[PDB]
Design a protein around this ligand. Structure first.
Ligand SMILES: COc1cc2c(NC(=O)Cc3cccc(Cl)c3)cncc2cc1F
Ligand SMILES: [Cl-]
Lengths: 299, 305
C-alpha cells in the first residue's frame, strides 16, 4: 500500500556527471564513453559557430570528481556542445538518447558543480516546460528513464523562464517547445492538464481503496472531450483509452465510466475530501507509472 | 525557483542492496563491509509470526541456511548474530562499494529518502517523513522488507530506517539500523494499530517560509500570537505542539525573510480557520508537513524573491 511520486534509482546517472568550466561560466556535463555533453551556452545575439571557432580545446576545463579530463576535440549539435575527451568513462552504462512526448514523465538528477544533490520525478507539460526545482549552476542536469538495465536520456536543463518553470533540450540539442537558448523575451504558453494521467491516478486510488468518487454512470468520448475542453484539460484520444485498458480490466471500471467520475469532479469539486492524500487532481503519473508502482518492477 | 519533494541521489545505497533467503522467505539486506543487515523475521514462517520466539528459531539455524545474493554472485555466510530486531549476517567478502556511513536514530518530524527494493533489486526512490505516531506513509509491496531509509550528508550516508511491516491502515513500521523499532510496535502479527496521527507544525511553518522565499505572500496577515495561544488553536486542528526548540530552529528562515516566527504562526492560525479559498501555496491545495527547516534551507535560494 501507499502511493508516492517515485523516481528511478539514480546511480547509473550519478557516475556520468562532470563539471564543465569555460571562462567564468561553470555548469554540468554528461560523460558517456569519450564524449562530454553540455549546453552550448557555456561558451557565452550569440552566433554560436563564430564563438566556438575562437575557442581551443584547452579553454574547456572538465572535472570528473577530483580528476581533470583532457579535452581533445569539440563540436556542436543543435544546442548541445560535444567535448571529445582523452578518457572513456569506465562507469558508462548501457544507454540511448530518446525524445519524449508532452505528458510523459521522467527522473531528474539535479547537479551543481558536477555533483548530484537530489533526484525528483516530473512530467513534460503540454506547453513543453517542466515544473522543476533548480538554482543557478543547475544547467546541464539531466532527465532520464530506466528500461530494464538501459538508461534512456531524454532531457538536459538549459534555462528558467520568468514564471519559475524550466526549459531544455533532448540529448541531441533540440529544444522541447518554442524556446531559444538566449536572453530574450520568452514566456511559457497557457498550460493544460494531462487527462490520461489524471485517469491513471484515479485508477491508482481505486487500487489503494479510495472509491468515493465512483458513480453508476458512463459517458461518450465526444461528450467527455466537450466537458474537458471547458476545464483546460488535454483532449482524450482513443489511443489514451486503449492505453488505460489494463487498469480498466483490473479494477472493473471502464475508461468512459471513470471519465464520468472525472466529469463530476470537475463540475462539483472534492467537497472537503482528498484522493491519495491530495486535494487537487494529480496529472504527473502516467498509466505505465501506475502499473509499475502497483507491481514492483526492479532495475 | 521551484519547490519539489526531492530525494537524495541513491547510487551509494544501490551498491549495498542484496537478496536474503531463508527457507521460503526472501527479502532485502544491506551489505556494508563484511556484514549483511536484514529484518530478523526472515527466519519466521507465517504461523511463527503470531508469537515468535526468535532466540529459539535462531539457535536452530546454521550459516548455510542463509542464502545471500549480491547481483549474480552468491555470498558465503560465515557467522550470524541478532541485535534487537535486526539479523546480522557475517559474510566472507567485504562490499567494495561500501560508502562512508553512520547509523543514526531519527526523531518524528525528520525526513529521509527511501530506496524501495524487491529481490535485492532497487526499483524506486522517494522522499518521506517519520510521522509523529512513528509510522511512515510509504509505497511498499510484498517483498519490500529490508528496504532502507537514508540521508546523504556531504558524502556520508546516514542510515536511519529499515522496513519491517505494513499496518492494517496501509502505513509502514520499521526499525533503526540497530534493530530498535520506531513506535510501540513489535515484529509480531499481533493486533497493533497506528495511533491517531498529527500534523508536523514546525515543518508546515518551514514550508510557509519556503513559499515566501519563492515570492508568495498572499497568506500573511498583520497579526501576531503568543506561543501558548498558537498551541491552544493548533491542538484543535490535530497539529503537533510547537516548542521553543522549534521556534529557535526557525530562526535563520525568520531572519532571511524578515517575518518573525510568531507572526508566521499567526498566518498559519488564519489558514487553519479560513482554508485556501481556491488558492494554492507552492502548487499545493493542502498544508505540506514533509519538508523540515533544514530541507527548506538546503533546497531554496539564499535570496528571497
Ligand atoms: C503480503 O502483503 C504485503 C506485505 C507487506 C509487507 N510485509 C509484511 O507486513 C510482513 C510481516 C507480517 C507481519 C509482521 C511483520 Cl514484522 C512482517 C511490508 N510492506 C508492505 C507490504 C504490502 C503487502 F501487500
Ligand atoms: Cl532527527
Amino acid at each position: 500500500s501507499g502511493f508516492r511520486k517515485m523516481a528511478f534509482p539514480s546511480g547509473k546517472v550519478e557516475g556520468c556527471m562532470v563539471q564543465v568550466t569555460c571562462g567564468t561560466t561553470t555548469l554540468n556535463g554528461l560523460w558517456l564513453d569519450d564524449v562530454v555533453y553540455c549546453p552550448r551556452h557555456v561558451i557565452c545575439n550569440p552566433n554560436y559557430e563564430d564563438l566556438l571557432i575562437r575557442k581551443s580545446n584547452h579553454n574547456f576545463l572538465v572535472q570528473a570528481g577530483n580528476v581533470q579530463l583532457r579535452v581533445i576535440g569539440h563540436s556542436m549539435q543543435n544546442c548541445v556542445l560535444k567535448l571529445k575527451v582523452d578518457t572513456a568513462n569506465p562507469k558508462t552504462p548501457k544507454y540511448k538518447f530518446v525524445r519524449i512526448q508532452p505528458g510523459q514523465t521522467f527522473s531528474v538528477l539535479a547537479c551543481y558543480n558536477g555533483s548530484p544533490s537530489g533526484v525528483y520525478q516530473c512530467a513534460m507539460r503540454p506547453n513543453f516546460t517542466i515544473k522543476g526545482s533548480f538554482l543557478n549552476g543547475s544547467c546541464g542536469s539531466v532527465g532520464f528513464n530506466i528500461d530494464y538495465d538501459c538508461v534512456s536520456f531524454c532531457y538536459m536543463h538549459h534555462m528558467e523562464l520568468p514564471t519559475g518553470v524550466h526549459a531544455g533540450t533532448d540529448l541531441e540539442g533540440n529544444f522541447y517547445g518554442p524556446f531559444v537558448d538566449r536572453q530574450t523575451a520568452q514566456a511559457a504558453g497557457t498550460d493544460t492538464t494531462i487527462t490520461v494521467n489524471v485517469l491513471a491516478w484515479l485508477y491508482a486510488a481505486v487500487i489503494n481503496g479510495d472509491r468515493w468518487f465512483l458513480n453508476r454512470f458512463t459517458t461518450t468520448l465526444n461528450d467527455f472531450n466537450l466537458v474537458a475542453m471547458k476545464y483546460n484539460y488535454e483532449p482524450l484520444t482513443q489511443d489514451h483509452v486503449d492505453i488505460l485498458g489494463p487498469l480498466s480490466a483490473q479494477t472493473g471500471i471502464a475508461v468512459l465510466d471513470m471519465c464520468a467520475s472525472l466529469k463530476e469532479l470537475l463540475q462539483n469539486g472534492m467537497n472537503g475530501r482528498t484522493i491519495l492524500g491530495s486535494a487537487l487532481l494529480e496529472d504527473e503519473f502516467t498509466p505505465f507509472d501506475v502499473v509499475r508502482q502497483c507491481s514492483g518492477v526492479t532495475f
